[PDB]
Amino acid sequence: SIGAPNTTFGTNNHHLYPDELNVSNNPHYRPKPVSYDSTLPPDHIKVYSRTLFIGGVPLNMKEWDLANVLKPFAEVQSVILNNSRKHAFVKVYSRHEAENVLQNFNKDGALPLRTRWGVGFGPRDCCDYQHGYSIIPMHRLTDADKKWSVSAQWGGTSGQPLVTGIVFEEPDIIVGEGV
């Protein structure tokens, strides 16, 4: 209602919405579900994807067409569409939303889009794109990587320290600063 988003973004990052806030007055508010399992290796963290990878993309559909086809399935937070590759990546605000998309989307096989697990945050060498998660060693997490894992508004730990065995849904890929 108040103002327009951007329709392409790029000044900050590929989110549909501006800075906003994960506050209770925002209807985009989501919980920070965190767990701790000792079954994980030492100095590692678990990251569930809230990101869909999209194959089969017709070149005429854009970022807000992805938000439009997924609108009755879940709220879309961010999107990187690559028409030259015939694909998109689409980040929704919760893991439960991303599963609720995957569960109902293209069940008949009529839509051109092919919904899979993508990654907003995840190491390729410790990935599990089949289950839709990755496990990350804290020795490879940069200052920015841990900064989002603690400080990200959607996903991460809710401001808790990264401990061995910590589980959550992917932190936002804001960045801030220079460098």
Side-chain angles (χ1 to χ4, degrees):
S1 186
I2 304 301
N6 210 129
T7 81
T8 19
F9 359 96
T11 184
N12 284 358
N13 208 69
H14 287 107
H15 313 99
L16 284 315
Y17 281 76
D19 50 274
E20 67 176 317
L21 222 305
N22 192 10
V23 286
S24 56
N25 61 81
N26 185 9
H28 280 120
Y29 183 93
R30 298 298 180 263
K32 271 69 69 262
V34 64
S35 346
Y36 311 93
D37 78 271
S38 84
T39 345
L40 285 178
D43 279 34
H44 285 78
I45 77 165
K46 237 288 299 295
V47 183
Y48 280 111
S49 186
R50 318 178 272 114
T51 295
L52 307 175
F53 175 62
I54 310 297
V57 177
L59 317 98
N60 196 248
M61 285 204 294
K62 309 297 172 141
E63 289 87 342
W64 281 111
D65 294 283
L66 259 302
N68 263 22
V69 299
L70 308 179
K71 172 271 192 196
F73 301 79
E75 283 68 271
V76 181
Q77 185 183 26
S78 9
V79 46
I80 297 89
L81 194 143
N82 232 112
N83 316 74
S84 176
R85 301 284 118 172
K86 289 165 70 284
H87 78 232
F89 298 95
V90 184
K91 301 121 179 76
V92 296
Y93 299 87
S94 97
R95 174 56 180 209
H96 224 242
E97 275 179 293
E99 283 182 45
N100 191 80
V101 185
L102 267 150
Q103 183 168 80
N104 296 278
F105 201 88
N106 205 7
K107 274 195 93 182
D108 310 88
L111 301 162
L113 308 135
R114 264 53 161 73
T115 310
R116 309 228 166 176
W117 287 119
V119 164
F121 201 58
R124 304 211 237 84
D125 51 32
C126 292
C127 81
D128 204 309
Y129 276 59
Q130 174 138 324
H131 304 143
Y133 61 72
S134 302
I135 311 92
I136 337 187
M138 281 115 84
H139 97 306
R140 91 97 58 62
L141 296 177
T142 70
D143 294 315
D145 284 351
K146 298 200 197 172
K147 190 74 113 86
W148 311 316
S149 298
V150 309
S151 200
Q153 305 193 24
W154 289 263
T157 70
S158 216
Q160 267 105 264
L162 283 176
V163 295
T164 302
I166 198 165
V167 182
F168 48 72
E169 68 190 346
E170 81 202 339
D172 290 327
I173 323 297
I174 72 298
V175 57
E177 229 252 79
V179 186

